[PDB]
Subunit: 420 residues, 2 copies
């Protein structure tokens, strides 16, 4: 009737109960999914703002609806803060997601059928970099590069060979599952020789870039894309950056009216909140701890006899290579899940095992590090993981051990802060 | 530092102040932008949920991340509630927006270059129905149909003519600025004639469809798209429905992994909350009031001698034809804005005037009807609008009159409920 009196606790108990139970779930597990994080209550408050009521097609001071004077201030703050954060000249804070950020760049620079060179799914590249079931592979001529079959590291000579062979219109750098540094300078050197554009998709490592813990793609890429969630620890959404303002104009037009309609102004306000958090000195210390934790985790696993792809990590990601142990990554991830530790199965490059099964798992540190985990806590986590993997090697039924480990997980995770 | 201590009113005063001022702005104006509404506090609470922390690529029970048991419950509730609301067999509640919902249908059914027949911008169709600056016009062979030049109404014989001529692969029905009923059965007869798919984009009128106040496209269209905001009064996002389970499977794959990545689970929970509100008996009463208010608004303006396109309306939209009055839509909308009344300039079909200028305005009743406006109140609004337009005909400067009306707008809007 008067919807302004509708309170969720009263009007939708089912959804209210589900939200409560999700909070409990997040609080009670060890979240090692590499792409996940926990946002601040401040981000949540802005995320839930009545700014959702406002249609704001266009850009600040250049909208297609009157009445945007306040939402313009929010978007301008998001843009100014992220430009400061990444030391860049152009930003677009409107993309609804990492995927839409990428698509805006495609719409700005490419025609359907154009050749695009990206990291293969097999090697740890993202869906949106040319995978067959994604728009990027369906509507464009996607060709792929892969890591070295021995070292599992990016091979720039190979990329240059493929760039000359295929003359791509766009070369993408970036990944969803790769544990080492990328040389963006080399990517630009290669695209210039073949007359291609260079897009750097830094969704996973955006927080490292922002704090100088990874080389910035801003001097090198024509377009830089990212999620605002993941290591940046912002609300769920996308982001495009560049130091090329002429390409920036093309990206602006590609995002709207090219790709999206009304932006999510409440999410953009939340992006501003998260960017201000990123600008705090403590954010650099957080990313340094994220990386330190990842190295401790990898080392605890090696100590227990498990193999780590590339032998370690320069980032938040740890890739476990389970081939010598006869354990599938699917079986591992599922047992770990029942033990209170969430992670993903992960394909080992060049493995002939179905990607549905895999021979690896992918672990990430940002979420627990946000809850205050230090190195010794990730050492403990590494041993819990090893305990479960050992059980899968030596038992048909891992239920007893899963319950054992879940007991430990529960006593460890309740020691760290969470939402009030 | 522990970000769980971050409270918005302490860590980001600038954003806090902007949100506070946006609440004030929304509260103090007469909002006649037809695509706008006000969501319930319950929807806002879910919208700001920590469900944003969960990655949930895939679909309920078929995700690419463990840990989705609770978010799966929210999405399933959204799906079941919307299927009941629209009496349909298939629903996708993941689209980030109306634009992305439409793009999923394109990815599901079309190839770049395919011929697509949709309503022209000039006649009140949407950007995503084939407009040149949008992906739909850039990447496809977009051809358009327009309203009748004498009546300003959809001519089905004309649409059928263009379908026979162009043999489109897809025919779209739906609009952003059209004030009358659309016959979906006619549209389906026409696509069957030429072997095309039929998409009904009901974003604006979705509330009328949900409550039986407009013919449903469910029995007729291969795919039905919508926003969840607008007349449905939900969180900002998109929606796809169908009665065709086969098409449904294709749409599911087109949305993910075709177009999007991680869904916004907090928004999906909010969609579920809003769908339950939609299922209440009062929502039907609300839509009926929306329509009666629009008719009252059009009639009041007519009393004052102003012209209404098509002579009235069957929905939430009132189109004012300002040509006989020598007032541009740009001057009208801008003068009204300063007087506390927000609306859009609107291109009159076939008018030679630049669409930047226009010779019309577009008014809508859902936002104020949500605040409890009745017919007599929209009559008052109509006279306030007419007062401003009279001023633009007879004044070198409308400032004094804008302030006079703003005082009256202020006195009227304060009488109606809003957020606490």
């Amino acid at each position: 009737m008067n919807i302004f009196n509708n309170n969720l606790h009263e009007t939708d108990k089912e959804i209210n109960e589900i939200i409560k139970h999700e909070k409990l779930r997040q609080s009670s597990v060890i979240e090692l999914i590499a792409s996940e994080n926990f946002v601040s209550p401040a981000v949540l408050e802005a995320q839930g703002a009545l700014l959702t009521n406002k249609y704001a097609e266009g850009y600040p001071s250049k909208r297609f609806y009157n009445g945007c004077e306040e939402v313009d201030k929010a978007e301008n703050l998001a843009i100014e803060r992220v430009k400061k954060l990444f030391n860049c000249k152009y930003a677009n804070v409107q993309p609804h997601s990492g995927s839409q950020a990428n698509q805006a760049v495609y719409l700005a620079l490419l025609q359907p059928g154009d050749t695009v060179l990206g990291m293969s799914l097999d090697s740890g590249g993202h869906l949106t970099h040319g995978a067959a079931p994604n728009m990027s592979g369906k509507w464009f001529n996607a060709v792929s590069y892969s890591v070295n079959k021995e070292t599992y590291l990016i091979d720039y000579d190979e990329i240059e060979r493929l760039a000359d062979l295929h003359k791509p219109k766009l070369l993408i750098a970036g990944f969803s599952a790769y544990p080492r540094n990328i040389d963006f300078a080399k990517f630009r050197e290669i695209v210039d020789k073949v007359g291609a554009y260079f897009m750097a998709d830094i969704a996973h490592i955006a927080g490292l870039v922002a704090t100088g813990e990874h080389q910035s793609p801003i001097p090198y890429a024509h377009a830089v894309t990212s999620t605002t969630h993941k290591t940046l620890r912002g609300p769920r959404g996308g982001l495009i950056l560049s130091n090329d303002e002429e390409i920036g104009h093309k990206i602006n037009s590609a995002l709207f009216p090219g790709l999206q309609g009304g932006p999510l102004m409440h999410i953009i306000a939340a992006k501003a909140v998260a960017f201000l958090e990123n600008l705090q000195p403590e954010y650099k210390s957080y990313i340094q701890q994220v990386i330190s934790n990842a190295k401790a985790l990898a080392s605890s696993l090696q100590e227990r006899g498990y193999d780590i792809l590339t032998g370690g990590t320069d980032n938040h990601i740890v890739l476990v290579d389970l081939r010598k142990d006869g354990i599938t990554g699917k079986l591992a991830a599922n047992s770990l899940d029942r033990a209170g530790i969430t992670c993903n199965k992960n394909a080992i490059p060049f493995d002939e095992t179905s990607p549905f099964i895999t021979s690896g798992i992918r672990l990430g540190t940002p979420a627990c590090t946000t809850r205050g985990f230090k190195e010794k806590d990730f050492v403990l986590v590494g041993h819990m993981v090893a305990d479960i993997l050992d059980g899968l090697k030596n038992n048909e039924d891992n239920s007893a051990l899963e319950q054992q480990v879940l007991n430990e997980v529960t006593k460890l995770i309740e020691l760290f802060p969470f939402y009030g």
